[PDB]
Amino acid sequence: LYVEDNWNKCDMVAIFLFIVGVTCRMVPSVFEAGRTVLAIDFMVFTLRLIHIFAIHKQLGPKIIIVERMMKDVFFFLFFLSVWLVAYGVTTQALLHPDGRLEWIFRRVLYRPYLQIFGQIPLDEIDEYANWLVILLLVTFLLVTNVLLMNLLIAMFSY
Amino acid sequence: EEGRLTLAFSLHEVSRVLKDFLHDACRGFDLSRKSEDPWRDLFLWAVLQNRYEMATYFWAMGREGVAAALAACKIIKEMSHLEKEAEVARTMREAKYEQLALDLFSECYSNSEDRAFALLVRRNHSWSRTTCLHLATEADAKAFFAHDGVQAFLTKIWWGDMATGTPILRLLGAFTCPALIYTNLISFFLLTRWRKFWGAPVTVFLGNVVMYFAFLFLFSYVLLVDFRPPPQGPSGSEVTLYFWVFTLVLEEIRQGFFTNEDTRLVKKFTLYVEDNWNKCDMVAIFLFIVGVTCRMVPSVFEAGRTVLAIDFMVFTLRLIHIFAIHKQLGPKIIIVERMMKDVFFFLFFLSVWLVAYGVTTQALLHPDGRLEWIFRRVLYRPYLQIFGQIPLDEIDEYANWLVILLLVTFLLVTNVLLMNLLIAMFSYTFQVVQGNADMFWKFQRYHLIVEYHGRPALAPPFILLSHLSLVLKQVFPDPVDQKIITWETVQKENFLSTMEKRRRDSEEEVLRKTAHRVDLIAKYIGGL
Amino acid sequence: RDSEEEVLRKTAHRVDLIAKYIGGL
């Protein structure tokens, strides 16, 4: 019944991460790995702090509302991310005929954080006329991702 | 008239009206012999003429009440879609031959919950051997498929073995574990146990979805790095991806045309295309074959690359259907699909507004003969000014241009208001359409469950060998059903009796009865 | 007891009783 909680599991995984990191901290060869594990342990510790709303009448139930929404939010966000990655694959395999896996992955990540955050690199997204029509169709399709975000927030509020 | 033109009424014309209506009543109707199952005959005779009271009466003495109430729903729905005087049509359509079957099945399922599931799969004796589900799907009985009893049936046929109890975690984890491990994990010569544990629908679902992901990633990498010169063209990509997509199309056609029976080919073809997602697969295969034909033309190399790279987009957009079975997420898809029809139009007009703004700005501030320059600048401003980039070096310059830039910044808040209107109507339509979403999802789940029941366990690659085995195989009880019939009748009359008791105990009847008795006793006492 | 359904049923039954009695006469 101790483990039957969800937050007791939070504390358990937190202590596990911290002890793994403190064991890595004794290995001079894995110095950076220990630093990484402690710096994620800190994140789980500071995420533990959420329970202090439980006693506040005004704010308290908002936490459990969010927790209820989170179960569907994770799945829907995962699929939306798969859609975004598919869009990235289409763009990369069409416009730019990048053998470095680092190049492909980092460009797909940057376009998710530049084109979806307000950066249209016309120097790399607009170039002979077939590529222009392709860029047109991509800008055309982006409104579907906007609709997907609208669906997300609508179901979230419902 | 048509029958005599080919080469007053007997029963042949009647039989033909009915067979034209349903084709489930194909037997149909010697003017002397005593009729067989006459109460049905009277049900029909009184439901064709749209007579209600005599119809439900004649029904309340017949054998079945989820076979016949659904056939009568279909018949009156068709006739109401065939009426001329719209008053008669609106009268017919408001007859409710559906609530009767839904009610009889509710009361027939609460009482046993395991005989009901022999009622559905049953081969009805009086209506020429067609299951209650056939009749229920012809009538488009959305209000019947949404019935909790039928939903539990669809579940127990979805899983198949250890039906209600198989958590998704242990289910997915059972991938590699052997027979006895499954026995210790999920309930259910041991080769037959492995068959009964990996022939069920849900295992076919997961197997085919895993093979689908593997197909998409193989196709991605072979569209990315397997474009060797047109001398070889698609070298490693072509063989694999072509084999896969070919067997996939073969699976689609087979499952489309070789599943139910050997009915009319044009009808099956038209109802295959009558979907929206069958059209998705059709246009996908068309795009892929166009691209693979372009891939043989060394002059249009880039065009083939483009067509394949759009084909990939339509393939990966096909993946959306796998939410249909998830209760929590399922109906969100159809909510979005409902909103999309208005979303497309409203977004198109908003885009026209944005382009008009771009034209005003370009024709005012910058007096660009290159069409490329104009179009690309209008596109960039839609992705820079509406995304957070105000180029003051090109939007601010002598004072008239300054006032113009001021007015443009002033007007931008109207586009902000337009976006607010968009999201507001978007959120409203969701609550507006949240009603029928559950019923539509239930219908979709039925179609999906029977679909995945139909197919074998092999994947699209192994679907070749599966269909090979299929073509190879193509190359080479009265007492208990009588018991179920009697039980059906007993439950029908139970339902009728309790409905009549509840109608008697209605307080309107009580008040009218006591008022009439008060009037009688008052007249009597006034007589004295 | 004060439920109006019980009140209505009680008064209807009493009306039926008195009606049967007065019809007997």
Give dist(CA B312, CA A89) in Å, integer. Answer: 9
| Contact state of B514 with C16 under an 8 Å Cβ cutoff | yes
In degrees, to the nearest 5, what angle opens at C-alpha A119 toward C-alphas A113 and A121?
110
Calculate how close chain B gets to C2, using CA atoms only, in Å.
17
Cβ burial of B422 (10 Å; 0-12, 13-18, 19+) is middle
Calculate how close chain B gets to C8, using CA atoms only, in Å.
8
Please enumerate residues of B whose Cβ is less than 8 A from a Cβ of C: 507, 510-511, 513-514, 517-518, 520-521, 524-525
Touch between A and C (at least 3 CB pairs under 8 Å): no
Calculate how close chain A gets to B386, using CA atoms only, in Å.
8
Per CB-CB distance under 8 Å, the chain B contacts of C15 are 514, 517-518, 521
| Alpha-carbon A150 to chain mean position | 18
- Check: CB of residue B445 under 8 Å from CB of residue B331: no
Residue B295: closest CA among B284, B308, B304: B304
Give dist(CA C7, CA B208) in Å, integer. Answer: 66
Calculate how close chain C gets to B519, using CA atoms only, in Å.
10
SS (HEC) of B288-303: HHHHHHHCCCHHHHHH
Residue B123 forms beta bridges with which residues? B131
Touch between C and B (at least 3 CB pairs under 8 Å): yes
Where do the DSSP E strands lie in B323-476? none
Looking from the CA of B34 toward its CB, the CA atoms found within 13 Å total 2
**Alpha helices by DSSP H, B329-370:** 330-365
Give dist(CA B262, CA A55) in Å, integer. Answer: 68
Pick among A96, A143, A144, A150 to test the B interface (most B CBs inside 10 A): A150
Give dist(CA B338, CA B373) in Å, integer. Answer: 38
Please provide the DSSP assignment of B146-172 as one string.
T-HHHHHHHHHHHH-SS-S---HHHHH
Looking from the CA of C25 toward its CB, the CA atoms found within 13 Å total 10
Residue B56, both tokens: 């439900």
Cβ burial of B95 (10 Å; 0-12, 13-18, 19+) is buried
Per CB-CB distance under 8 Å, the chain B contacts of A87 are 313
Residue B166: closest CA among B178, B152, B155: B155
Cβ burial of B20 (10 Å; 0-12, 13-18, 19+) is exposed
Please provide the DSSP assignment of chain C as one string.
---HHHHHHHHHHHHHHHHHHHHH-
- Check: CB of residue B107 under 8 Å from CB of residue B495: yes
Please enumerate residues of C whose Cβ is less than 8 A from a Cβ of B: 5, 8-9, 11-12, 15-16, 18-19, 22-23
Per CB-CB distance under 8 Å, the chain B contacts of C11 are 514
- Check: CB of residue B68 under 8 Å from CB of residue B74: no
Give dist(CA B485, CA B304) in Å, integer. Answer: 63
Residues sharing a CB contact under 8 Å with residue A106, sequence separation 6 or more, in sequence order:
none
Give dist(CA A157, CA B310) in Å, integer. Answer: 34
Q: After which residues is chain A broken (C to N over 2.5 A)?
A: 97, 127
| Contact state of C15 with B525 under an 8 Å Cβ cutoff | no
Phi, psi of B123 (to 5 degrees): -95, 105
Residues sharing a CB contact under 8 Å with residue B291, sequence separation 6 or more, in sequence order:
B304, B306, B307, B308, B310, B311
Looking from the CA of B17 toward its CB, the CA atoms found within 13 Å total 16
- Residue labelled with tokens 């190049």: A103
Q: Which residue of B has its CA nearest to C11?
A: B514
Q: Which residue of A has its CA nearest to B228?
A: A97
Residue B303, both tokens: 């065009």
Residues B486, B490, B496, B497: what is their CA dihedral angle, to the nearest 10 degrees?
150
- Check: CB of residue B37 under 8 Å from CB of residue B126: yes
Pick among B505, B516, B521, B525 to test the C interface (most C CBs inside 10 A): B521
Touching chains, B (3+ CB pairs < 8 A): A, C
End-to-end CA distance of chain C: 33
Residue B44: closest CA among B23, B18, B10: B18
- Check: CB of residue A120 under 8 Å from CB of residue B383: yes
How many CB pairs below 8 Å do chains A and B form together? 96
Q: Name the DSSP letter for residue B123.
A: B
In degrees, to the nearest 5, what angle opens at C-alpha B129 toward C-alphas B125 and B130?
120
Residue B131 forms beta bridges with which residues? B123
Give dist(CA B220, CA B240) in Å, integer. Answer: 12
| Contact state of B520 with C19 under an 8 Å Cβ cutoff | yes
Q: After which residues is chain B broken (C to N over 2.5 A)?
A: 7, 29, 188, 367, 397, 476
Please provide the DSSP assignment of A72-105 as one string.
HHHHHHHHHHHHHHHHHHHHHHHH-----HHHHH
Residue B510, both tokens: 């009580």
Helix axes B277-294, B236-257, angle to 10 degrees: 150
- Check: CB of residue B166 under 8 Å from CB of residue B186: yes
- Residue labelled with tokens 């955050």: A117
CB atoms under 10 Å from CB of B353, counted, come to 12
Residues sharing a CB contact under 8 Å with residue B203, sequence separation 6 or more, in sequence order:
B197, B457
State the amino acid at position B336 in one-letter form: V
Give dist(CA A21, CA A12) in Å, integer. Answer: 14
- Check: CB of residue B166 under 8 Å from CB of residue B159: yes
Cβ burial of B403 (10 Å; 0-12, 13-18, 19+) is exposed
- Residue labelled with tokens 């080469």: B7
Per CB-CB distance under 8 Å, the chain B contacts of A92 are 224
Give dist(CA B413, CA B421) in Å, integer. Answer: 12
| Contact state of B524 with C23 under an 8 Å Cβ cutoff | yes
- Check: CB of residue A34 under 8 Å from CB of residue A25: yes
Of B510, B521, B524, the CB nearest to C12: B510
Please enumerate residues of B whose Cβ is less than 8 A from a Cβ of A: 220, 223-225, 227, 302-303, 305-306, 309-310, 312-313, 316-317, 319, 323, 326, 328-329, 332, 335-336, 339-340, 343, 347, 351, 372, 376, 379-380, 382-384, 387-389, 422-423, 426-427, 430-431, 434
- Check: CB of residue B99 under 8 Å from CB of residue B146: no
